[PDB]
Amino acid sequence: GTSKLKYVLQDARFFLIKSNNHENVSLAKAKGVWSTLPVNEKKLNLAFRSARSVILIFSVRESGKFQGFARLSSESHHGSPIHWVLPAGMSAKMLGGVFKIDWICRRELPFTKSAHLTNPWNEHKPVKIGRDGQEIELECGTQLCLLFPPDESIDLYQVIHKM
Numbered sequence: 001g002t003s004k005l006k007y008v009l010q011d012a013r014f015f016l017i018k019s020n021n022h023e024n025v026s027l028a029k030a031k032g033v034w035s036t037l038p039v040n041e042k043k044l045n046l047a048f049r050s051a052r053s054v055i056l057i058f059s060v061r062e063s064g065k066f067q068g069f070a071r072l073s074s075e076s077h078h079g080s081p082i083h084w085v086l087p088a089g090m091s092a093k094m095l096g097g098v099f100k101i102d103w104i105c106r107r108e109l110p111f112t113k114s115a116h117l118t119n120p121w122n123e124h125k126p127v128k129i130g131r132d133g134q135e136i137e138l139e140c141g142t143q144l145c146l147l148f149p150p151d152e153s154i155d156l157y158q159v160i161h162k163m
């Protein structure tokens with residue numbers, strides 16, 4: 001059912017994550033971690049102390065899809081190294097701290113199914129459009145997450161307890 005999901009999302013904040021390759025999103029799914037450049041690191045840390053839920057929604061460039069969404073369970077901290085595949089012109093020290101995350105949905109969602117959702121914080125372009133880190137406004141954020149196929153392998157009871 002959808003009810004506990006609607007509970008987790010209540011008064012959440014949402015952020016579009018754009019990844020260059022599937023390899024890093026797979027690593028995020030397996031280890032429960034994400035890291036960003038300092039510009040986004042700072043904004044995620046503010047949002048983490050400002051809302052009961054900060055949701056990251058992941059998209060792999062050129063995939064035509066979202067790959068799932070997760071909630072932050074900590075602010076960023078500097079631990080066990082993470083063997084990210086780094087783009088041309090980037091090294092591991094340029095990355096910021098490591099955010100812990102609890103996945104809420106690990107299934108895909110194709111852009112064709114979110115083509116009625118516009119993001120007011122990005123000039124009302126379709127929600128799929130946005131730079132890495134772009135905030136998605138509350139109402140669009142919620143409906144985007146509800147569009148995902150349910151992930152019956154996830155139990156939001158433990159997630160609810162961290163709120």
Ligand SMILES: O=C1N=C2CCCCC2C(=O)N1
Nearest residue numbers: 024035036037084085086087
């Ligand atoms: O915000 C970013 N997060 C990541 C995560 C993994 C390395 C590539 C990467 C990046 O280039 N930018």
